[PDB]
Symmetry: C3
Subunit: 114 residues, 3 copies
């Protein structure tokens, strides 16, 4: 799985250990080994949410499976929780787009997962 | 809805008020309240279009519905218009990818929109 | 088509001519004329892969068509190969998401491709 967070929160406000925390928590939540988890955080972004420049985030979670109604609610609670605790972003100022990727459409190590 | 612009135009060339303008114009065009519109501009990017580094943009519009043939033509005229007027990017050096998101695949406020 | 690479490799390690090489090699591989190819490279990123901050990349390739089982395998071999040679990224630390875009969902030059 791959999780990306784009935020206007400044780099200095991203705490040490945040990528490792996301890796671990996402491994746990998706039921996958951590070796499969990639995380990417992009601070200092020029963004607004509802026209306000208050802290906000625009994120994506891509996975081969483990995406669906209930699962996505559970990921959103987990992820908005981390963003609120660590980056002081209100959950109502977070959007997370979820993508169920087909194995044939994910490249890795010179091939795909198909 | 969420609109992202990645461009090689420099940060100083993004006018003050641009994120607000995009928010308002997209609220109008989508017919959704502005509280739901998120906008994200990423200048100073290492980019080419057609092998040239003249000003260009790579953009994305995600919406739960309000995506389709005619709508997307209208959005493209609107958004290329804004990018040409405000950032001086030629419409033929803009790509916009449109995504009709399922409500279950959009996380917000600890849950999803399903 | 549009190809994006996000990486923790520093900007100074991205060689001159990398965007042009990606453009040409993508045109070779997809068959699309080089005038239609857009490329975007984002270095200096805060990312991890498998919980490690060794060199890695998260990429995307969007195209109207020219996406599928065998094509995507071939793109991955190509693109991992370029990343390894030019940016010294191990192929097993690269993910590439492939998107077959509907023509109605790609804006350009004030309209869409539908
Ligand atoms: C890069 S692409 O993946 O978005 N595809 C294309 C990009 C293009 O850009 C410029 C064009 N004309 C003048 O410039 C095009 O006609 C054009 C066509 C593209 O492909 C198709 C293939 C079948 C149906 C619809 C579109």
């Amino acid at each position: 799985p791959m999780f990306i967070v784009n935020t206007n929160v400044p780099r200095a406000s991203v705490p040490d250990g945040f990528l490792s925390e996301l890796t671990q928590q996402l491994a746990q939540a998706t039921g996958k080994p951590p070796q499969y988890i990639a995380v990417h955080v992009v601070p200092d972004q020029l963004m607004a949410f509802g026209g306000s420049s208050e802290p906000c985030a625009l994120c994506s979670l891509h996975s081969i499976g483990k995406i669906g109604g209930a699962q996505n609610r559970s990921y959103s609670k987990l992820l908005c929780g981390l963003l609120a605790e660590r980056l002081r972003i209100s959950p109502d100022r977070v959007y997370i787009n979820y993508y169920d990727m087909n194995a044939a459409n994910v490249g890795w190590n010179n091939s795909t997962f198909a």
